[PDB]
Short mmCIF file of all heavy atoms in Angstrom, two decimals:
data_model
loop_
_atom_site.label_atom_id
_atom_site.label_comp_id
_atom_site.label_asym_id
_atom_site.label_seq_id
_atom_site.Cartn_x
_atom_site.Cartn_y
_atom_site.Cartn_z
N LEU A 24 -23.10 -12.08 -48.72
CA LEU A 24 -23.71 -13.10 -47.93
C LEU A 24 -25.10 -12.64 -47.38
O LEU A 24 -26.13 -13.33 -47.42
CB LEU A 24 -22.84 -13.51 -46.76
CG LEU A 24 -23.27 -14.71 -45.93
CD1 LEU A 24 -23.34 -16.05 -46.74
CD2 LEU A 24 -22.36 -14.87 -44.71
N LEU A 25 -25.12 -11.38 -46.87
CA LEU A 25 -26.27 -10.83 -46.25
C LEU A 25 -27.31 -10.49 -47.30
O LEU A 25 -28.53 -10.66 -47.06
CB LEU A 25 -25.91 -9.60 -45.39
CG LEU A 25 -27.03 -8.84 -44.67
CD1 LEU A 25 -27.91 -9.74 -43.83
CD2 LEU A 25 -26.43 -7.70 -43.85
N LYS A 26 -26.92 -10.13 -48.49
CA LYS A 26 -27.88 -9.88 -49.54
C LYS A 26 -28.65 -11.17 -49.75
O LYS A 26 -29.85 -11.12 -49.92
CB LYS A 26 -27.09 -9.53 -50.86
CG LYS A 26 -27.95 -9.35 -52.06
CD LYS A 26 -28.23 -10.67 -52.73
CE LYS A 26 -27.42 -10.86 -53.98
NZ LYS A 26 -27.89 -12.02 -54.74
N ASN A 27 -27.94 -12.27 -49.87
CA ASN A 27 -28.56 -13.51 -50.18
C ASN A 27 -29.38 -14.05 -49.01
O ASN A 27 -30.38 -14.75 -49.17
CB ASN A 27 -27.46 -14.53 -50.56
CG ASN A 27 -27.03 -14.29 -52.02
OD1 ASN A 27 -27.90 -14.24 -52.86
ND2 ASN A 27 -25.73 -14.18 -52.26
N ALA A 28 -28.95 -13.75 -47.80
CA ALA A 28 -29.79 -14.02 -46.62
C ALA A 28 -31.14 -13.40 -46.66
O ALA A 28 -32.16 -14.01 -46.50
CB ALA A 28 -29.09 -13.80 -45.31
N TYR A 29 -31.14 -12.08 -46.98
CA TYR A 29 -32.40 -11.44 -47.17
C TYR A 29 -33.31 -12.04 -48.25
O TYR A 29 -34.55 -12.08 -48.10
CB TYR A 29 -32.22 -9.92 -47.47
CG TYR A 29 -31.94 -8.99 -46.32
CD1 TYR A 29 -30.72 -8.35 -46.18
CD2 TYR A 29 -33.03 -8.80 -45.36
CE1 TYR A 29 -30.55 -7.49 -45.06
CE2 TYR A 29 -32.79 -7.84 -44.26
CZ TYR A 29 -31.57 -7.30 -44.09
OH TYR A 29 -31.30 -6.41 -43.14
N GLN A 30 -32.74 -12.45 -49.31
CA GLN A 30 -33.43 -13.09 -50.43
C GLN A 30 -34.12 -14.39 -50.05
O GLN A 30 -35.17 -14.74 -50.58
CB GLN A 30 -32.60 -13.32 -51.67
CG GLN A 30 -32.24 -11.98 -52.36
CD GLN A 30 -31.58 -12.24 -53.69
OE1 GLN A 30 -30.87 -13.18 -53.94
NE2 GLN A 30 -31.68 -11.22 -54.62
N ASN A 31 -33.44 -15.14 -49.13
CA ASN A 31 -33.93 -16.45 -48.67
C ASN A 31 -34.63 -16.41 -47.30
O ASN A 31 -34.90 -17.40 -46.64
CB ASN A 31 -32.79 -17.46 -48.66
CG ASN A 31 -32.24 -17.78 -50.08
OD1 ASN A 31 -32.65 -18.80 -50.66
ND2 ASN A 31 -31.37 -16.91 -50.53
N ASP A 32 -34.83 -15.18 -46.86
CA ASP A 32 -35.45 -14.89 -45.54
C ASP A 32 -34.75 -15.56 -44.38
O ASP A 32 -35.38 -16.04 -43.39
CB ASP A 32 -36.99 -15.22 -45.53
CG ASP A 32 -37.83 -14.39 -46.51
OD1 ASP A 32 -37.64 -13.13 -46.44
OD2 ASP A 32 -38.62 -14.80 -47.40
N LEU A 33 -33.43 -15.58 -44.47
CA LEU A 33 -32.59 -16.01 -43.46
C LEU A 33 -31.75 -14.93 -42.76
O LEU A 33 -30.88 -15.18 -42.00
CB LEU A 33 -31.60 -17.11 -44.03
CG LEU A 33 -32.17 -18.47 -44.25
CD1 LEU A 33 -31.37 -19.36 -45.16
CD2 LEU A 33 -32.36 -19.22 -42.92
N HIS A 34 -32.14 -13.72 -43.07
CA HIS A 34 -31.41 -12.54 -42.51
C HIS A 34 -31.44 -12.45 -40.99
O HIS A 34 -30.44 -12.08 -40.38
CB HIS A 34 -31.94 -11.13 -43.09
CG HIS A 34 -33.49 -11.09 -43.13
ND1 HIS A 34 -34.30 -11.78 -43.95
CD2 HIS A 34 -34.28 -10.33 -42.37
CE1 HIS A 34 -35.56 -11.41 -43.76
NE2 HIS A 34 -35.58 -10.56 -42.80
N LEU A 35 -32.61 -12.70 -40.35
CA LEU A 35 -32.65 -12.57 -38.92
C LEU A 35 -31.75 -13.62 -38.23
O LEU A 35 -30.91 -13.25 -37.37
CB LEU A 35 -34.08 -12.50 -38.35
CG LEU A 35 -34.85 -11.28 -38.75
CD1 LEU A 35 -36.35 -11.47 -38.52
CD2 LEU A 35 -34.41 -10.10 -37.87
N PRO A 36 -31.86 -14.89 -38.53
CA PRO A 36 -30.85 -15.89 -38.01
C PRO A 36 -29.41 -15.53 -38.36
O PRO A 36 -28.51 -15.79 -37.59
CB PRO A 36 -31.27 -17.23 -38.67
CG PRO A 36 -32.67 -17.03 -39.20
CD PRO A 36 -32.92 -15.55 -39.31
N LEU A 37 -29.12 -15.05 -39.55
CA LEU A 37 -27.73 -14.82 -39.91
C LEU A 37 -27.19 -13.67 -39.05
O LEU A 37 -26.04 -13.78 -38.57
CB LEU A 37 -27.61 -14.42 -41.40
CG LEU A 37 -26.22 -14.02 -41.84
CD1 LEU A 37 -25.18 -15.11 -41.66
CD2 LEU A 37 -26.18 -13.49 -43.27
N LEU A 38 -27.97 -12.65 -38.86
CA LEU A 38 -27.50 -11.48 -38.05
C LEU A 38 -27.44 -11.77 -36.59
O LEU A 38 -26.70 -11.18 -35.82
CB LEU A 38 -28.37 -10.25 -38.31
CG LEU A 38 -28.33 -9.66 -39.74
CD1 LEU A 38 -29.47 -8.68 -39.96
CD2 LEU A 38 -26.95 -8.99 -39.97
N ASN A 39 -28.26 -12.77 -36.13
CA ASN A 39 -28.17 -13.21 -34.76
C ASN A 39 -26.76 -14.00 -34.58
O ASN A 39 -26.13 -13.79 -33.53
CB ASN A 39 -29.34 -14.15 -34.38
CG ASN A 39 -30.57 -13.34 -34.00
OD1 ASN A 39 -30.59 -12.15 -33.61
ND2 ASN A 39 -31.82 -13.94 -34.24
N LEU A 40 -26.40 -14.76 -35.56
CA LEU A 40 -25.10 -15.40 -35.57
C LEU A 40 -23.94 -14.48 -35.74
O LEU A 40 -22.93 -14.61 -34.98
CB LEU A 40 -25.09 -16.42 -36.76
CG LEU A 40 -23.81 -17.15 -37.12
CD1 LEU A 40 -23.25 -17.93 -35.99
CD2 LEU A 40 -23.92 -17.96 -38.40
N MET A 41 -24.00 -13.54 -36.71
CA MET A 41 -22.85 -12.82 -37.06
C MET A 41 -22.54 -11.59 -36.16
O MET A 41 -21.37 -11.13 -36.11
CB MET A 41 -23.03 -12.25 -38.48
CG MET A 41 -23.00 -13.41 -39.51
SD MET A 41 -21.38 -14.19 -39.63
CE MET A 41 -21.61 -15.45 -38.79
N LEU A 42 -23.52 -11.14 -35.37
CA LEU A 42 -23.43 -10.01 -34.47
C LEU A 42 -23.66 -10.39 -33.04
O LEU A 42 -24.31 -11.40 -32.74
CB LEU A 42 -24.42 -8.90 -34.88
CG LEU A 42 -24.21 -8.24 -36.16
CD1 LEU A 42 -25.39 -7.28 -36.50
CD2 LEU A 42 -22.93 -7.50 -36.15
N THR A 43 -23.09 -9.61 -32.12
CA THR A 43 -23.31 -9.80 -30.64
C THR A 43 -24.58 -9.01 -30.31
O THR A 43 -24.92 -8.13 -31.08
CB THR A 43 -22.17 -9.35 -29.84
OG1 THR A 43 -22.01 -7.93 -30.05
CG2 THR A 43 -20.85 -9.99 -30.15
N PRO A 44 -25.22 -9.36 -29.19
CA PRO A 44 -26.43 -8.58 -28.77
C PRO A 44 -26.10 -7.16 -28.63
O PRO A 44 -26.95 -6.31 -29.02
CB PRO A 44 -26.72 -9.19 -27.43
CG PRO A 44 -26.20 -10.68 -27.50
CD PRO A 44 -24.95 -10.55 -28.33
N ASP A 45 -24.96 -6.77 -28.10
CA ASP A 45 -24.63 -5.38 -27.91
C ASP A 45 -24.37 -4.63 -29.22
O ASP A 45 -24.65 -3.41 -29.33
CB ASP A 45 -23.38 -5.19 -26.96
CG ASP A 45 -22.15 -5.95 -27.51
OD1 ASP A 45 -22.04 -7.13 -27.39
OD2 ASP A 45 -21.17 -5.31 -27.91
N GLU A 46 -23.80 -5.30 -30.21
CA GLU A 46 -23.75 -4.77 -31.56
C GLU A 46 -25.13 -4.37 -32.13
O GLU A 46 -25.35 -3.36 -32.69
CB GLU A 46 -22.86 -5.56 -32.47
CG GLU A 46 -21.42 -5.58 -32.12
CD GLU A 46 -20.63 -6.83 -32.57
OE1 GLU A 46 -21.23 -7.66 -33.18
OE2 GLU A 46 -19.38 -6.86 -32.27
N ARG A 47 -26.01 -5.35 -31.99
CA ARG A 47 -27.36 -5.19 -32.56
C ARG A 47 -28.04 -3.98 -31.80
O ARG A 47 -28.73 -3.21 -32.42
CB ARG A 47 -28.17 -6.48 -32.39
CG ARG A 47 -27.76 -7.62 -33.22
CD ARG A 47 -28.83 -8.71 -33.26
NE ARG A 47 -28.85 -9.44 -31.96
CZ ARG A 47 -28.02 -10.49 -31.64
NH1 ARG A 47 -27.12 -10.86 -32.49
NH2 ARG A 47 -28.16 -11.08 -30.47
#
């Protein structure tokens, strides 16, 4: 999923969704 997010430049929104602020 994340590989493909990076390819479509959706990595930042995906990681905002998938992780909590404290994890980041």
Side-chain angles (χ1 to χ4, degrees):
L24 189 66
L25 179 51
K26 177 274 256 189
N27 281 311
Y29 276 115
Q30 289 190 333
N31 293 265
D32 294 310
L33 282 162
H34 48 286
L35 291 161
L37 175 62
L38 293 167
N39 281 334
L40 171 61
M41 292 293 100
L42 291 176
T43 61
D45 59 286
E46 289 156 2
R47 289 192 290 273

